[PDB]
Amino acid sequence: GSHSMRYFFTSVSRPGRGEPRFIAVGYVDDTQFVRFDSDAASQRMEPRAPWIEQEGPEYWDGETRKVKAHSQTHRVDLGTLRGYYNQSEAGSHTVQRMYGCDVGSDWRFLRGYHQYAYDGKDYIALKEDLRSWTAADMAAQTTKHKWEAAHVAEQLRAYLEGTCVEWLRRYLENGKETLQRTDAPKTHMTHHAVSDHEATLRCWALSFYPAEITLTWQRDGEDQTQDTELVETRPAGDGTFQKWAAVVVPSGQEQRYTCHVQHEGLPKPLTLRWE
């Protein structure tokens, strides 16, 4: 279907205990493919997906250099932000940044992103027009003015609409066997008696890829939200995902309920019923 590439950067200050901890990761859809950890010994951008390992030495030297540069600008940012918010030089603060692009099933640029957060809340973000900025608060206005004077939007737009989507397409093709193929969810339902009056039906979806999936319960063919529970989709640890949805039902009424599973890896939605 549609695809995306994203880079996630987290920098955490550690006053009096050395340099800020900087962690960078790159994803294509739900698959991580690179990372950099300021505290690791390698000091290099490292591969985390097989398909990116076929990139040559210039790719790695370049990404290593660029990621270290992102590391340094964030080191400066923490100081700048501590200032904008008149905060103590002693506390630990967190700056986060994310940028990347989305392409549609036709592989054409669909949307781009470039945004920052400080201490858990939005700070500034590039709007969908890839032209203007949204400063989350008063302090961010300074950055907004600064970025407008330095034409940061123009530079980002060229990268998001060009370079970003071009490399995403290259990744999608080199890694087609794992990024463009699907792994259908293996499903089953379990029954747990809660009491003599109620029972819990739990619908399972395991070992699927991509992560996107829809689990819904119906009673006599009508969607059911009440008395249901849906856990967050979670990583199995091998590249696939898991998720379950549960509904508490009156004893003896189990047969009225059906679990519906929608996923790109299925020729058609699946329907499960107890027994």
Binding site: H70, T73, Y84, Y123, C164
Partner: peptide
């Protein structure tokens, strides 16, 4: 591939 230019808040 990463963006190649420095950006400072």
């Amino acid at each position: 591939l990463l963006f190649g230019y420095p950006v400072y808040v």
